[PDB]
Design a protein around this ligand. Structure first.
Ligand code: ATP
Ligand code: ADP
Ligand code: MG
Ligand code: MG
Lengths: 71, 175, 51, 471, 494, 469, 71
C-alpha cells in the first residue's frame, strides 16, 4: 500500500529542505490526473470545498484534504 | 510491496547525492547503516515501541546515527516521521544497486568446485563485462562441493551453467 | 500389447540411464579436478566468446 | 529525444514512465515499435493512448492491440497528439480499423493527407440545430408509433438475437440509397462476418463510394472497441462541419463501447461502479454520444443499435442511454417468440416526433388509439391467462379482438428478411399505414382471421392473404 | 538400447545454457507471484522447478503474476521459475490426429508421445473482414431435424444450447461420426466433463472409426481452472493449423458455460471486481475472441473453414440468462433443446421455434430447401396447435391436415443414437413426408417405414440416390413418386 | 529444520512462519503438540492444513479443531505430507474423525499401520474403465427403474422418516453379501445424535462389520467438515486399488461439503462467487467427485444425499452436484405410509443408465412399460376419486388392476428388516425382476390377490405367498 | 420457578462481546450439572441477536465478511 505523496521528486525536496521546512501554503503541485480528479501535494492552507485554479485557468473544488495531499 | 517504495526513497536520495557531488560518502555511510542494522535487529523493534515519543526516537537516531552525512540522517528522520523505518535495509540495498548501476559495477555469484584463483576471477570479469554491458564486474565465490568440475555463474537473474548439468542434460536426452 | 511392450522398453531404458548417470557422477568425483578446474575456466571463456 | 520505458503490463493496460517534465497529456498516442533482438523476443507494433497520470513520471495507458510480447523496459515513442485519423474525400469507399488505417486491401492512404484528432470537445449550446422532421422508413411500427427524426439520434434497443441487426440492415436498405448524402458505418463489437456481408452488399447496391466504413469487431481487445466509434464519428463530423453535408451514421452495438470501458476500468485502478461497470459509465458515454449532433452546418441522423444484457432494460448501460436518444424502438424477445417481426414493443417505443404539430392530427389520433387498445389488452392479459376470453364484458372482447389484429399488423415482411423466409418484403408509406390502422380501428376488418395479418405490408395485402386462406 | 546411446554419445557437442530465472513470492489457489524474471514478456510460458508450466498474465513493477497450468501443490515459496521464450505454444500438426491431449498438448491417453514439428500460439488474431467469404458449403450433421430445420454451413458458429441431460453431447458425437466420408477434420473439446464420460465418448468414437480424423482435447472437472480456461483456445489453435492449410475443420466445445465458470474462478482469485452473476467484465471477450476466430476464409487465404459448435448449459430452460445471451450474440444461430420434448420421448429434442440458423438456408443442398420448408411450417403448426387443441373437437382441416401430418413430422424427425443418415435419404424421407405419402401409414409405424424405406432405397432406388449425390437437386418428381408408391405396396401397415 | 513459529491466530485461520526454503507444501498437515509449562498456559493438541503461501516465509493454514489457547511463538511440527489416514482391514467396523483417529473407545490404531494421503489427484484417463456396467443391488425398484452404475454418483432425495438409513443399510448388506465389496459411510457436517443413531442401527443389524464410518460433524471447524468426504474416500480408495473390489461410499448431505467449502473460502478472505459460494465451487466438487470413478482395478459408486436449499434445483450447490450425478432415487413419504418398503418413488426416480445400449432391450421395455402403467394409474387416481372404482372403462380397470399389482411388487423384504419383521429378506437378481415384471405386465398373475405382492422378493415367492393365503 | 432456574442476561445496551458470550456462559453453567447426572434445560432467547453481535465484532475486527456480512 504505497501512499500517493511518495514521489521521488517530492521526497527529494523534503530530504533537502528537512532542517528548514518551507511552506507550500498557496501553491501546489499535481500528483495524479485522471477522470476529473487531481491529487495535489502542497496547498497547506486550503479550505475544504474551495475554488482552486490550475495553471490552465481551469477551476477545481478541493473536496478531500488528506494528511499530505489535496483531493 | 516494500521494494518499490525502497526504490522510490533510494532514487530520491540518489538524486540528492548526485546533485551534491558526494556520491562516495553517501554510499559509504549507507553501507555503514546497513551493516549496523544487520548486526542488531532489536533496533527496529525499539523504534516501533509506542511509549517512546517521536522526539525521543528522533533523539535516538540523532545520537546513534551520527557520523553519517546530512542527507542520510535527514532521510532516516524522514522515514521515522512517515512510520517507514522498517524499510531502511531495503532502502540501503536499492540505493547500493543504484550506486553500482551508476559506477558500472556489476554483481555476480560464481559457484565452482575448486576455489578460483584471482587471475581466473579477473578473466571472468573481463569476459562478462562486455556481455552485460557494464564497465567492471565483481565475483563472489562459494565452493558448494556438490558441484563437480565446473563453474555455475549468476549475474542478477541469469544463470550461466557449465558445471554439472551437462550430464543431467545428456541423461535427460537419452531417456 | 504392443504399446505395453514399447512402454516396458522405455522404462528399462530410463532405469539404465539413471543408473549410468549416478555412476558417472561418482567417477567424476573420484577423478582429480585440478586439471579439470583449468579446463572448466577455459570452457567458460569459450562459452562467453560464443555468446 | 524524450522516450519512455514500459513499467507494468496488466492485460490491455500498460504503464509507461517518462522523464521528469516530458510526460504526455491525457489521450495522446504512444507508439511501441520493437525489433526483436534475440530468439526470446517478439516483433511489436503497438499504439498506446494515455488515460491517467499516476505520479513519479509514470503514465497509465490503454493498448489498442494485444499486449502479448511486451517486455518491461521496452522503449516507447511519444507522438505529441491523440490518435489521428485520415479524413476527407479519401475515406469514401474505404474500410478502416481503429487506427484509421485502411483494411480493404485497395491501397495505403498517403502521409500528406489530412488527419483530424479523435478527441475533441462536444458541440456547444449555440451551435446546435433543433429542427424536427420525419425520416420516413417504410416500417409500420416506426412510421406509426415512434417516428424517426431526420437529423436526430435513433436507438435500437434489443436483447441477444432479437432483430436489431436485421432492423439496422432494413433501415440501410430503406434510407441509404434514398439519402443522397454521405453514410458512415461504425461497427463496434459486432460479428466480423457481419462486416463482410455488409461491405459486399454495399458493393452490390452501390451505396459504397458515398460510404465510409470502420470496423472494430468483437475479436478486438477493448482498447480498440473504446475508440472505434470515435473514429467513425470524427469521419462523420468532418463531413458535417467542413462540407456541411447530410450524414447518415450507423453504429451497431454502441453498448460494446461501455462494455469495453468496463473491461479496462478494473485494471485502470477504479472502484467498481453500479453492478460491474466503471464509475465513469455516464461521462464516458456522454463525451461520445453528445458529439453525434446536428449543428448549424450539417446534420447527422444517427441510427444506433444498443444491446441489452440478459434482457434487462434496467441495466445501467441501457438505462443511461435512453436520455441521449430522440427516438427509440425497444425490441422484445416476447414478441420475437410470437413470430412478430420487427419485435418492437409498441408501448415502450417512443419518439420526440409523435406530436400533432409534426405528424399531423390524424396520424396522432390513430397512433394514440392503437396504443390505447394495446395498453388495454396488456391490462387484460392476466384475466385472459387464468379465466380466458369467456368472462370479458363484451367491450373487452372487442378490445382483445381488435388488439390481436393490431399487434399482428405491426409485424411486416422485410426486404432483408427475404433470405430468412422467401417472402419478398414491402415498403409501406406513412399515409397507407395510418389508413390501414384506421380501418382496423373502425371495425372494417374484424371478419378476417387474425393469422391473415402477419408479415404483410399494406392492408390490401391483408385482404388478399385472407382471400388465399379461404375466408 | 545400447546402439542409439553410443550413437548419441558420439554425436553430442558441448554447450552452455542460459537460464533467466525468477523466485516465487506467493503460491495460492493456482496463482503465483514471482520476483525476478526481468526480461519475461506478457503471455509467456514459464516453467517451475518440478516441470509444471505457468502463464505470465500480469507484469508488474517488481513481480510477475504467474498462472499455474497444472497441479500447484508441488510449488512452494522459494522455488525457481525460469523462462521458455515462447508465448503460449501448443503442439500442432497432422500427428495429433487420433490422440487425446490436455490443453497444453501433452498426451493423456497414454499411447506414447505426440511427435509434432510446428506450434501455434494460443491467443492469435481472428481473420479480418476482407479475409472472409460467405458461408455456402453444407456441413452435414446427419441429424434430420438439424439438416432440415436448422442447417449448418461450413464456417459458421452454431450454438447448441439446452439444459443438462438433453442430448447436446449426443448431437456432437453424431455430427463428428458423420464426417467420415467428408474431408472434415473434427475436434472435440471437453471442458469440465466427467472424465469417465469423456472415456466413453472416446470409445464410442473409435467404435465408429471416428478417431481416424478427430482430435479430443480434454480438461476434466477435477483439473484446475487454468486448464479449464485454455481448453477451447487450444481447440482453435489445433484447428487453425489445418484451417490455414486449406482444410475444413469442425470444432465442438462441450459446455462453454463450464469455461465461463472457470474463468470466473480464475478472475475472482485474482480479485477482479465481478459483474452480473459474479462474472468478470471480460466474460464476453472470453467467448468473443474465441468464436470469432472460427471463420470461412476467402480464396486468397486458402478457402478453408473452421465451423464451431459451442455448447451452453441452461438452468431450467432460461435462455434469457447472462452467459446464454452472451453466446447467442456471438454465434450465427442456436439449436435449442427442450427438456419437455426430451422427457416426452422426442429425441433429438430440438425446439424448432427457438432454434434458428442464419447463414443456413444458404447452406442447404438445393433439394433440402424445397423439401424442408413445408416440413418446418408443418412442425410449427403442429407444436402450436397441440398445446391449445388438446381438449374438445374442432374443424376437419385442423383435425387432420395439421395434427395428423404433424404427428408424422414428429415421428420422422426422431432418430436413434449414433446412427447418422446421409442427406439424400433425409431428402427422400422428408419428401415422402411433406408430399402427403405418410398420411395413410399410422403414427406408430412411421419409424419402421423409414427404416425399411432406406433398405429399399439401397437396393432399388439407387439412381435417385446417385442423382441427389451428384446433381444435388431433386430427381424428376414423377420418377420419385413411382418409387415411393411402389414401396408403399410392399410396406406392411400392421 | 522444519520447526516454525505461530504468527497470527484469528478464528479457525492460523498463520505460521518457517525458515526460508523449508516451507511446507500446500495441503500438508501441521501438528501442534504443546504441553503447558506453567499455570498461564493451556495444553494443546491441534493440527493444521496448509492453504496458502503468503510470502515473507509465512504460511496461512486452516484449523481442524479449536484454536483457543494458541500463543504467538508456539512451535509447529511439519509432517511433510497431507493428513495421512489409516487404511486397510483395521478400518472396517470403526468410527473415525477427519484425522483418521478412532472416535470409538475400542482402541488406538498402532503407528506401523499404513496411512494414505488425503489429497490425491484423480485417476488418469488411461486408468478408467471404458464400459459402463451396472452395479447390481438386488433392490428391485433400484435395479429395475433407476439402475446404478459402478463408478456412479447417485442422489438420495428424502430424509426424516422415509427409510433413508434402512435403504443405506440394505445397500451395504447386499453389496457386501453378493459383490464381496465393503462400504464407507462419510457423514459430512451432519449432527452428532443422528450419527449415534446410525452407529447403533448398524451395530445391532450386523452391517457395521463390513463398513467404515467417518464422522465430521457440526461442532467441528469448517476446515474439519470440508475434508470429511476426502478422508472417507481415501478409505474407499484402498479397497478400490489394493484389493480391487467394488466399494460403496456414502456421503450424507453433500450440500454440507459445499457450504463448508464456502465457509473456508470466507475465512481465507477470497472474493465471493455467484450467490454466496466460493469461486472454486466447481473445482472443489470436481476434485471430490472425479475420484469416485470406475477403474480397471475396481470401482467406487457413491450414494449421496442432497439438500437442495430453498427448494431450488438451479442454486449453484445443487447445480454443480447434478452435473456429476447419474441416478436419483426419490424417497417418498406417501409410499412409506402406504406400506411399500423401500419408499423409492418410481416415477420421480430417473437414471442415466436406464437405456437400451447399457442394460439391454428387454429391461428397457419392461421398465418403460412399468413407468407408463404407473403414470396412467396416477392420472386415473382423480377419475377414481370423483367417479368411483368401477364404470371407468374395461382398459382403465385393467390398467389399474395391473398397476396396483406392480406398485406393490416393487417393495421387498430387507435383510436389515429381519430383526423387526422376522422374515429373512431377499436378494433379487435383475433378470428375475425383469422376468417378474414382464409376467405381471402380460397378465400371468391377475388372478392372485394383490396383498400377496406386498413385501416379497421374487415372483415364485408371490406364487407361494398366494397359495399360502 | 426460581428455586431451580439460573438467569443469564445480556441486554441491548451491553457491549457486543457480552451478547456474543451469553449462550456459551449458558452451556458452561449447564454442562456442570450435565456431567453430574442432572437434567438441564437451556433456553436461548433470540440467538439471532448473538449472530448480529458476532457480525459486529468480526466486522470491527475487520475479518472478511460473507453472506449478509456475517463472518
Ligand atoms: N437421439 C437420441 N436417441 C436416443 N437417446 C438419446 C439421444 N440423444 C441422447 N440420448 C440419451 O440421452 C442421454 C444423455 O444425453 P447427453 O449426455 O448427450 O446430454 P448432455 O446434456 O450432454 O448431458 P450432460 O450435460 O450431463 O453431459 C444419453 O445417455 C443418451 O443415451
Ligand atoms: N424481420 C425479420 N423477419 C424474420 N426473421 C427475423 C427478422 N428480424 C430478425 N429475425 C430473426 O431473428 C434473428 C436476429 O438476428 P440479428 O438481428 O442478426 O441479431 P441481433 O438481434 O442479436 O443483432 C435473425 O437470425 C432472424 O432469424
Ligand atoms: Mg447484432
Ligand atoms: Mg454433455
Amino acid at each position: 500500500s504505497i501512499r500517493a505523496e511518495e514521489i521521488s521528486a517530492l521526497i527529494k525536496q523534503q530530504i533537502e529542505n528537512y532542517e528548514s521546512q518551507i511552506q507550500v501554503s498557496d501553491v501546489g503541485t499535481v500528483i495524479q490526473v485522471g477522470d476529473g480528479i487531481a491529487r495535489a501535494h502542497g496547498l497547506d492552507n486550503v479550505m475544504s470545498g474551495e475554488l482552486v485554479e490550475f495553471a490552465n485557468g481551469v477551476m477545481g473544488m478541493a473536496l478531500n484534504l488528506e494528511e499530505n495531499n489535496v483531493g | 510491496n516494500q521494494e518499490v517504495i525502497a526504490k522510490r526513497y533510494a532514487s530520491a536520495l540518489f538524486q540528492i547525492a548526485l546533485e551534491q557531488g558526494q556520491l562516495d560518502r553517501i554510499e559509504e555511510d549507507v553501507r555503514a547503516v546497513r551493516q549496523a542494522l544487520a548486526e542488531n535487529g532489536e533496533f527496529l523493534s525499539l523504534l516501533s515501541y509506542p511509549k517512546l515519543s517521536l522526539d525521543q526516537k528522533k533523539a535516538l537516531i540523532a545520537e546513534a546515527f551520527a557520523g553519517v552525512s546530512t542527507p542520510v540522517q535527514n532521510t532516516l528522520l524522514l522515514l521515522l516521521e512517515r512510520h517507514r523505518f522498517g524499510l531502511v535495509p531495503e532502502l540501503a540495498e536499492q540505493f547500493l544497486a543504484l550506486v553500482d548501476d551508476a559506477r558500472g559495477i556489476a554483481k555476480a555469484v560464481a559457484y565452482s568446485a575448486r576455489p578460483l584463483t584471482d587471475e581466473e576471477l579477473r578473466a571472468l570479469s573481463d569476459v562478462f563485462a562486455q556481455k552485460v554491458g557494464k564497465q567492471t564486474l565483481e565475483i563472489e565465490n562459494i565452493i558448494d562441493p556438490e558441484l563437480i568440475g565446473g563453474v555455475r555463474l549468476r549475474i542478477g537473474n541469469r544463470i550461466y551453467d557449465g558445471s554439472v548439468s551437462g550430464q543431467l542434460e545428456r541423461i535427460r536426452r537419452q531417456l | 500389447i504392443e504399446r505395453e511392450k514399447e512402454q516396458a522398453m522405455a522404462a528399462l531404458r530410463e532405469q539404465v540411464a539413471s543408473l549410468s548417470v549416478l555412476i558417472a557422477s561418482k567417477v567424476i568425483e573420484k577423478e582429480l579436478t585440478e586439471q579439470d578446474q583449468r579446463k572448466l575456466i577455459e570452457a567458460y571463456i569459450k562459452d562467453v566468446q560464443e555468446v | 529525444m524524450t522516450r519512455g520505458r514500459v513499467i507494468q503490463v496488466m492485460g490491455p493496460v500498460v504503464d509507461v514512465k517518462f522523464e521528469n517534465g516530458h510526460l504526455p497529456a491525457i489521450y495522446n498516442a504512444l507508439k511501441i515499435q520493437h525489433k526483436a533482438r534475440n530468439e526470446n523476443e517478439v516483433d511489436i507494433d503497438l499504439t498506446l493512448e494515455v488515460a491517467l497520470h499516476l505520479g513519479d513520471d509514470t503514465v497509465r495507458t490503454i493498448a489498442m492491440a494485444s499486449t502479448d510480447g511486451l517486455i518491461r523496459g521496452m522503449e516507447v515513442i511519444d507522438t505529441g497528439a491523440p490518435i489521428s485519423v485520415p479524413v476527407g474525400e479519401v475515406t469514401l469507399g474505404r474500410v478502416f480499423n481503429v487506427l484509421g488505417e485502411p483494411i480493404d486491401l485497395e491501397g495505403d492512404i498517403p502521409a500528406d493527407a489530412r488527419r483530424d484528432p479523435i478527441h475533441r470537445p462536444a458541440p456547444k449550446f449555440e451551435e446546435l440545430a433543433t429542427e424536427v422532421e420525419i425520416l420516413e422508413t417504410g416500417i409500420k411500427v416506426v412510421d406509426l408509433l415512434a417516428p424517426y427524426i431526420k437529423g436526430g439520434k435513433i436507438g435500437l434497443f434489443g436483447g441477444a438475437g432479437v432483430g436489431k441487426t436485421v432492423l439496422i440492415q432494413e433501415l440501410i436498405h430503406n434510407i441509404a440509397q434514398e439519402h443522397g448524402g454521405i453514410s458512415v458505418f461504425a461497427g463496434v463489437g459486432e460479428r466480423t462476418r457481419e462486416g463482410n456481408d455488409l461491405y459486399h452488399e454495399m458493393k452490390d447496391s452501390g451505396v459504397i463510394s458515398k460510404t465510409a466504413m470502420v470496423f472494430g469487431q468483437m475479436n478486438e481487445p477493448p482498447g480498440a472497441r473504446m475508440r472505434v466509434a470515435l473514429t467513425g464519428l470524427t469521419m462523420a463530423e468532418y463531413f458535417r462541419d467542413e462540407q456541411g453535408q447530410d450524414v447518415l451514421l450507423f453504429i451497431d452495438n454502441i453498448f460494446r463501447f461501455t462494455q469495453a470501458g468496463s473491461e479496462v476500468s478494473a485494471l485502470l485502478g477504479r472502484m467498481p461502479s453500479a453492478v460491474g461497470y466503471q464509475p465513469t459509465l455516464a461521462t464516458e458515454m456522454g463525451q461520445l454520444q453528445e458529439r453525434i449532433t446536428s449543428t448549424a452546418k450539417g446534420s447527422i441522423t444517427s441510427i444506433q443499435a444498443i444491446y441489452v444484457p440478459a434482457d434487462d432494460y434496467t441495466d445501467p448501460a441501457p438505462a443511461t442511454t435512453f436520455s441521449h436518444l430522440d427516438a427509440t424502438t425497444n425490441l422484445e424477445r416476447k414478441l420475437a417468440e410470437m413470430g412478430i417481426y420487427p419485435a418492437v414493443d409498441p408501448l415502450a417505443s417512443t419518439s420526440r416526433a409523435l406530436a400533432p404539430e409534426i405528424v399531423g392530427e390524424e396520424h396522432y389520433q390513430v397512433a394514440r388509439k392503437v396504443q390505447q387498445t394495446l395498453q388495454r389488452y396488456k391490462e387484460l392479459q392476466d384475466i385472459i391467462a387464468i379465466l380466458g376470453m369467456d368472462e370479458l364484458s363484451d367491450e373487452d372482447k372487442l378490445v382483445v379482438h381488435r388488439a390481436r389484429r393490431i399487434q399482428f399488423f405491426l409485424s411486416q415482411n422485410f426486404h432483408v428478411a427475404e433470405q430468412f423466409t422467401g417472402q419478398p418484403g414491402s415498403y409501406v408509406p406513412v399515409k397507407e399505414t395510418v389508413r390501414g390502422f384506421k380501418e382496423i380501428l373502425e371495425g372494417k376488418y374484424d371478419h378476417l382471421p387474425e393469422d391473415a395479418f402477419r408479415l404483410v405490408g399494406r392492408i390490401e395485402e391483408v385482404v388478399e392473404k385472407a382471400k388465399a386462406m379461404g375466408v | 538400447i545400447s546402439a542409439l546411446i553410443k550413437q548419441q554419445i558420439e554425436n553430442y557437442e558441448s554447450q552452455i545454457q542460459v537460464s533467466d530465472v525468477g523466485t516465487v513470492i506467493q503460491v495460492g489457489d493456482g496463482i503465483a507471484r514471482a520476483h525476478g524474471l526481468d526480461n519475461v514478456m506478457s503471455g509467456e510460458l514459464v516453467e517451475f522447478a518440478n516441470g509444471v508450466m505457468g502463464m505470465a498474465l500480469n507484469l508488474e513493477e517488481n513481480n510477475v503474476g504467474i498462472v499455474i497450468l497444472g497441479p500447484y501443490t508441488g510449488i512452494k515459496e522459494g522455488d525457481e521459475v525460469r523462462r521458455t521464450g515462447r508465448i503460449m505454444e501448443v503442439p500442432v500438426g497432422e500427428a495429433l490426429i487420433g490422440r487425446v491431449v490436455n490443453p497444453l498438448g501433452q498426451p493423456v491417453d497414454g499411447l506414447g508421445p505426440v511427435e509434432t514439428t510446428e506450434t501455434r500460439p494460443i491467443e492469435s488474431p481472428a481473420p479480418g473482414v476482407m479475409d472472409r467469404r460467405s458461408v455456402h458449403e453444407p456441413l452435414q450433421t446427419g441429424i434430420k431435424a438439424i439438416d432440415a430445420l436448422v442447417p449448418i454451413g461450413r464456417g459458421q458458429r452454431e450454438l447448441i444450447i439446452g439444459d443438462r441431460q438433453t442430448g447436446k453431447t449426443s448431437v456432437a458425437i453424431d455430427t463428428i461420426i458423420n464426417q467420415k466420408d467428408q474431408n472434415m477434420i473434427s475436434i472435440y473439446v471437453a471442458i469440465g466433463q466427467k472424465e469417465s464420460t469423456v472415456r466413453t465418448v472416446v470409445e464410442t468414437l473409435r467404435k465408429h472409426g471416428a478417431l481416424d480424423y478427430t482430435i479430443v482435447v480434454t480438461a476434466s472437472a477435477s483439473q484446475p481452472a487454468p486448464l479449464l480456461f485454455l481448453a477451447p483456445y487450444a481447440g482453435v489453435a489445433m484447428g487453425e493449423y489445418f484451417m490455414y492449410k486449406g482444410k475444413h475443420v469442425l470444432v465442438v466445445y462441450d459446455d462453454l458455460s463450464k469455461q465461463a465458470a472457470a474463468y470466473r474462478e480464475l478472475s475472482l482469485l485474482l480479485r477482479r471486481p465481478p459483474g452480473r452473476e459474479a462474472y468478470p467484465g471480460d466474460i464476453f471477450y472470453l467467448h468473443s475472441r474465441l468464436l470469432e476466430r472460427a471463420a470461412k476464409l476467402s480464396d486468397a487465404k486458402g478457402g478453408g473453414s473452421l465451423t464451431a459448435l459451442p455448447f451452453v448449459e441452461t438452468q431450467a430452460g432460461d435462455i434469457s440468462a447472462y452467459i446464454p445471451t452472451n453466446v447467442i450474440s456471438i454465434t450465427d444461430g442456436q439449436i435449442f433443446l427442450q427438456s419437455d420434448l426430451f422427457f416426452s420421448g422426442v429425441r433429438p429434442a430440438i425446439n424448432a421455434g427457438l432454434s434458428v440458423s442464419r447463414v443456413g438456408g444458404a447452406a442447404q443442398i438445393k433439394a433440402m430447401k424445397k423439401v424442408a420448408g413445408t416440413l418446418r411450417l408443418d412442425l410449427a403448426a403442429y407444436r402450436e396447435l397441440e398445446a391449445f387443441a388438446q381438449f374438445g373437437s374442432d374443424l376437419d382441416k385442423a383435425t387432420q391436415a395439421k395434427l395428423a401430418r404433424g404427428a408424422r413430422t414428429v415421428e420422422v424427425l426422431k432418430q436413434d443414437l449414433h446412427q447418422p443418415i446421409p442427406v439424400e435419404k433425409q431428402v427422400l424421407i422428408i419428401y415422402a413426408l411433406t408430399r402427403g405419402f405418410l398420411d395413410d401409414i399410422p403414427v406408430e409405424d412411421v419409424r419402421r417405414f423409414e427404416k425399411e424405406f432406406y433398405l429399399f432405397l439401397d437396393q432399388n432406388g439407387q439412381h435417385l440416390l446417385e442423382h441427389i449425390r451428384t446433381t444435388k437437386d431433386l430427381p424428376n418428381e414423377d420418377d420419385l413418386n413411382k418409387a415411393i408408391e411402389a414401396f408403399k405396396k410392399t410396406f406392411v401397415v400392421s
